[PDB]
Design a protein around this ligand. Structure first.
Ligand SMILES: Nc1ncnc2c1ncn2[C@@H]1O[C@H](COP(=O)(O)OP(=O)(O)O)[C@@H](O)[C@H]1O
Ligand SMILES: [Mg+2]
Length: 331
């Protein structure tokens, strides 16, 4: 049960000033776009006579708002999370296409993490009469199959081990957890943590395109009007700003393994043989992908014709997150 959305980042000012470029995607409606689309002036098309069609669960064009992306991706998940089920939201795509803008955003235009925390704080506050709710978050990096605490950068990578604990809960040893008293501090914590991500080998103040950033929100709740019990619910909402998708084995082991696991989940014959074990990222999300965990991937693409190749790749990647139409072969 994997949901795929596409978000086309807007042009920059120079990009729009060179329109030599041309818009390589036409967002027809809320569910279908056209890649490499035909030429929109009837006369000009007639002169040219002298494309790929894509349907996804939800489309966001250059001018969509952060609130529009949030309400149509992760807000519908919150109920699951408060009912005790895990939920997961990815930002996939090539570097420069708006992954970090969508997940983290800016203090002026906050992204999915921020708005998720805002709505969750409100929800906690409304159901305070009947529920005891503990809300906490952590924010880690997977780079070159090494785990770093983006909110406690002084803990040694070897001390951050993925543990499958009791029940069916994946955890990370010695990973710090934080209870921001407010939304302002949620954003502060996002920004500091992003500042802690691995630098690009090239220039500076440049997060490496190979950095996975995994935010995790742990929601635990318990009945307040019953008697003293051990019944609780405990769910994890994972919001991931993935490494860049553009073209040692451990550099992009996690990205490739996420791809392979999505393949397996979309194929009914191998959906029970998902290779979560093949990387840090997929191991961390062993109980945070399959049908059980509501999973939505936000594919982020560039409208610029300059990015034809990568964008097409990305779209085709999104296109193969669709369930395979198998046949019930007999004998
Ligand atoms: N929807 C958007 N609206 C305005 N600016 C955007 C949008 N998406 C991306 N940007 C800008 O484009 C640049 C690249 O975005 P970023 O999120 O860093 O891409 P990625 O994280 O995929 O490398 C950033 O400076 C960001 O501010
Ligand atoms: Mg980024």
């Amino acid at each position: 049960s994997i949901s795929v959305a596409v978000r086309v980042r807007p042009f920059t000012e120079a990009e729009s000033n060179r329109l030599g470029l041309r818009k390589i995607i036409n967002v027809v409606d809320d569910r279908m776009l056209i890649f490499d689309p035909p030429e929109t002036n009837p006369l000009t098309k007639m002169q040219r006579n002298a494309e790929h069609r894509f349907v996804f669960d939800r489309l966001f064009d250059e001018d969509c708002t952060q609130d529009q992306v949030y309400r149509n991706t992760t807000q519908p998940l919150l109920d699951s999370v408060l009912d005790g089920y895990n939920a997961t939201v990815f930002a996939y795509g090539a570097t420069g296409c708006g992954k970090t803008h969508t997940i983290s955003g800016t203090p002026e235009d906050p992204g999915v993490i921020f708005l998720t925390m805002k709505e969750l704080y409100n929800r906690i506050e409304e159901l305070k009469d009947t529920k005891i709710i503990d809300i906490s978050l952590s924010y880690l990096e997977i780079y070159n199959e090494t785990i770093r605490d983006l909110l406690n950068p002084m803990t040694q990578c070897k001390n951050l081990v993925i543990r499958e604990d009791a029940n069916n809960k994946i955890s990370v040893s010695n990973l710090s957890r934080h209870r921001p008293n407010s939304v302002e501090e949620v954003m502060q914590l996002i920004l500091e943590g992003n500042k802690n991500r691995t630098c690009s080998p090239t220039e500076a103040n440049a997060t490496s395109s190979r950095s996975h950033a995994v935010l995790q929100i742990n929601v635990i709740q318990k009945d307040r009007t019953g008697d003293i019990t051990e019944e609780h619910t405990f769910a994890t909402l994972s919001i991931i700003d993935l490494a860049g998708s553009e073209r040692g084995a451990n550099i992009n082991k996690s990205l490739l393994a996420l791809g392979n696991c999505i393949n397996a989940l979309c194929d009914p014959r191998r959906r029970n043989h998902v290779p979560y074990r093949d990387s840090k990222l997929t191991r961390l999300l062993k109980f945070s992908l399959g049908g059980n965990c509501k999973t939505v991937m936000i594919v982020c693409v560039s409208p610029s014709s300059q990015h034809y190749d990568e964008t097409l790749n990305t779209l085709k990647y999104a296109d193969r997150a669709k369930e395979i139409k198998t046949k019930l072969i007999r004998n």
